[PDB]
Amino acid sequence: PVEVTALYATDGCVPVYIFSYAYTHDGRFEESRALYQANGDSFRVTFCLLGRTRPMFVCRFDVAALQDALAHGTPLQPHIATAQSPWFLSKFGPDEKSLVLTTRYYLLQAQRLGGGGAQAIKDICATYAIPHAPRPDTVSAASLFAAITRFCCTSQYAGAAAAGFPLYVERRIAADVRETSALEKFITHDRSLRVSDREFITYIYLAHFECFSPPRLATHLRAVTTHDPNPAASTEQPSPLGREAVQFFCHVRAQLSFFERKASRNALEH
Amino acid sequence: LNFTSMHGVQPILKRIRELSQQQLDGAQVPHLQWFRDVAALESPAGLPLREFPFAVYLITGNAGSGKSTCVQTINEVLDCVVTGATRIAAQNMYSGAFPINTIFHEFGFNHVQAQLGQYPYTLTSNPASLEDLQRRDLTYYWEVILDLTKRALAPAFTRSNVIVIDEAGLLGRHLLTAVVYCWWMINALYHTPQYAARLRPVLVCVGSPTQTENVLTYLICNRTLREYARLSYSWAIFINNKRCVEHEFGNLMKVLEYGLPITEEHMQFVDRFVVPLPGWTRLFSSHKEVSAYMAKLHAYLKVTSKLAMTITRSQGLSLDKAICFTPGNLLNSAYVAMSRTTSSEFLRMNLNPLRERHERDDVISEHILSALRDPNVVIVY
Ligand SMILES: Cc1nc(N(C)C(=O)Cc2ccc(-c3ccccn3)cc2)sc1S(N)(=O)=O
């Protein structure tokens, strides 16, 4: 059945508002897509405040009113027979695609213990380029959680969009790590017959720009942007970062003064 | 956008965790008695030689190199007590992602006025084993560690064994061991779960080695401390600058920091800021010569403030927009002042501190170059 972890808040610093929130014990995208309708008999809930969230109580649950609370953001009446200022609008608060998904990942969904277990990057949700179908009435105008709870709970992003978020975080990090790790191995293995230190700084500071410059980092982000959440047709691509860096790492002729030549060029175009 | 950091803090958190989990053997733990014993002495001559075990991780780099975001990540992944050298660093590392006090406050600070160095001492074996070193460091704060030892025997260190200490350049070498001792002296007093667990205090000192002997020099430089903490496996350096966006000036601050030969081209460059503005910050090289604006700057409002400091007092300070150092008494001294303002459209100087005779120190730079050459030291851009 459904074990749901409800991250909740209250007007009087602790009604209850589940401002983000549900898993089933296994033994991956599609099952969650089948749970985020638009799907469980029993909703056993762990109500939590700020892993980075600590359970405060547990309720076994009328799945009707609970599903209402999870879906149209309604607050549970203390129907429950079973912290910081609404701050929460400054942090995690650029817009929807961040406010509803990164809050649910950071504080709630690193229980899957992915390599994303680790920061509040709010920097992978933006490479999460799922199509935005707009809606009116999304005027923040929120200062004393229902005003933000409704906002959160009825947005299209959190559906198949929500189910594909942890998977995309993992995929993001996987490709990023393979490229940065290959680059780091090439940087380290080239620090081992060594040059007069005058251009050793020229080597370090120029390699760390021939592989992580702003333009090539943008190219990588393009090669790792995702448009449809379904992992099947996800629009990612092989990243050029390693392949376009190995344009610079042809220091194998240095096995049978060049760094400042490339330094002078790069410096000119920059 | 900074991104390579999100992937360089990762290996750091691995080593910091490997160090925060390990448990010592049986005897290698300060027994509680070892503290009343220190409180039982009148001259730091009765101190028995013996290790207080510890491990440390170094996060070092230029000002504005991305050390702050590494602290931000470690604070929110590892359970740590985050602290700073001086209230500048405390108000710096203080909250934009998800309190913080000085490391002096953590072990407590009457304890201000200190006749440090009063009592004497000399080492023994030339490659002094840590036990020789701490024997000296505890002596240095006699009448400081002494009151601390007597009072506590008559608790933020007891929460976690990872202790973030930003801006380690402001703390002398005698604060590496003190923060060790007053950690062990507190965990062994209350018998916290850390003490039962045989955990060594993992200190993470973050600060600029060449831009401000301090803790960083005491670790980077001593051979026994390097062999004990394995700084080859415990060092990560932030090669970057997100506030210098000009090629020539960035090359000056790079020939200075890492200690490579000055060039007549660099001299020619520096002969462009010499100027013998009401905003340019007047840094100096004498605490009298800063009050000297009692005459010139003060009462200049009669006829018609971070503005006045010394270069060695502006280390770790934050400035927006003129070095007037006394000649003959100045290469690692200007580097402190020239790097305050972000760009060279606000720096001013009075003597060309690269053609004028000066005083250049190169031990820290030599170690930094050898460290970057080391295959096991993390480098982050
Ligand atoms: C073309 C190019 N651009 C490069 N960048 C992006 C930079 O230097 C950026 C920078 C600028 C200043 C520093 C610094 C270093 C020590 C002390 C203060 N500040 C570090 C980094 S490096 C090269 S090059 N000539 O090696 O190909």
Swiss-Prot record, chain A:
It is found in: Host nucleus. GO terms for molecular function: DNA-directed RNA polymerase activity; zinc ion binding. It comes from the Viruses. GO terms for biological process: bidirectional double-stranded viral DNA replication; DNA replication. Signal peptide: none annotated. Its main location: host cell. The keyword Zinc applies. Keywords: DNA replication, Host nucleus, Metal-binding, Transferase, Zinc, Zinc-finger. Essential component of the helicase/primase complex. Unwinds the DNA at the replication forks and generates single-stranded DNA for both leading and lagging strand synthesis. The primase initiates primer synthesis and thereby produces large amount of short RNA primers on the lagging strand that the polymerase elongates using dNTPs. Associates with the helicase and the primase-associated factor to form the helicase-primase factor. Belongs to the herpesviridae DNA primase family. This is DNA primase. It comes from Human herpesvirus 1 (strain 17). The lineage of its organism: Viruses, Duplodnaviria, Heunggongvirae, Peploviricota, Herviviricetes.
From Swiss-Prot, chain B:
Transmembrane segments: none annotated. Changing H31R: In strain: Nonneuroinvasive mutant HF10. It is found in: Host nucleus. Gene3D superfamilies: P-loop containing nucleotide triphosphate hydrolases. Pfam families: Herpes_Helicase. ATP binds at G61, N62, A63, G64, S65, G66, K67, S68. HAMAP family: HSV_HELI (MF_04030). Belongs to the herpesviridae helicase family. Associates with the primase and the primase-associated factor to form the helicase-primase complex. Component of the helicase/primase complex. Unwinds the DNA at the replication forks and generates single-stranded DNA for both leading and lagging strand synthesis. The primase synthesizes short RNA primers on the lagging strand that the polymerase elongates using dNTPs. Possesses helicase-like motifs and therefore may act as the helicase subunit of the complex. This is DNA replication helicase. The gene is HELI.
